[PDB]
Symmetry: C3
């Protein structure tokens, strides 16, 4: 629905995050990601957690999540939203972390990393 | 461009979709219908209503991001004019003349089949 | 990586910026932009520079850059990330302007200006 930031909030913007290449040491021309949308989303949400934690922030501090999916051929070229929702539910609305941010999921035509099916963009804010 | 004073209270909405043509139909048949003008009218009303339930109006909007899909009924063509027909009913009006920061891009699809528009909103009251 | 704003920040939101059409007075049916991604990104990033300067802001004040690319027909419909990077680096991470904002680059299906290969959306803030 909606999230409201107090005027005393400290706001942190992340770059869009992609899954890790299977070999981060591969050449610029063979660097690529593997896995289906659910697997890749799980990797990317963990990266968000890790980056946020290194700032003293938690997944409960997320105020806005923008998720860009690439269509999966097995799904008629459509975005794999069900795969995404599985991973997303492991990280948000659970008991370790109950909160859910404002979010948006759209199907894009492509991402910069070959084989990547998901990129996530994050805004977090710690009230004060 | 819009500049927020440092005393602003800022609100983020989730992306908003039009309503399915049959919300009780099965999981694979859920879908939206209508052209861009009609679907934009449903979505902008949801934005209006959600904002009102928080004490905010369309004048409080600072950033509108609009994702359009090509219209299947027109062979996948982008119906930007339809969007602008609906959009003008809500913004740049006389009750509230101001214009928010906005972005309109054509995405490949939305999570609701047949949906041609999603709107993402940022609002702030001093 | 990440950019975090103190709660003293004044935040500025720009509309998405497109490259200029090759004939701004051409018909609604022939209006179109030209050039490859690197050329257009250089035009679009300049509009960001110019608009910020007119607001008392600099490119170092940019906190978030969202870049939407259209696939280049000359690239089989692939996004021209290398062209984008050439242009982007003339503007961010230089020696006069060292800062780099949180950014996201994704490939969309289309933009509202035919022939446009890039739109850039900007959020800026000067701390106080």
């Amino acid at each position: 629905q909606s999230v409201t930031l107090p005027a005393n909030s400290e706001v942190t913007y992340l770059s869009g995050l992609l899954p890790d290449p299977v070999d981060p040491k591969a050449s610029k021309e063979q660097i690529h990601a593997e896995g289906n949308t659910e697997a890749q989303a799980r990797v990317v949400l963990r990266k968000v957690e890790t980056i946020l934690a290194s700032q003293g922030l938690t997944l409960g501090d997320v105020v806005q999540l923008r998720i860009y999916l690439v269509g999966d051929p097995a799904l008629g070229g459509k975005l794999d939203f069900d795969g995404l929702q599985v991973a997303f539910r492991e990280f948000f609305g659970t008991q370790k972390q109950p909160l859910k941010p404002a979010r948006t999921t759209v199907q894009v035509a492509g991402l910069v990393l070959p084989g990547a099916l998901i990129e996530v963009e994050t805004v977090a804010a710690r009230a004060r």
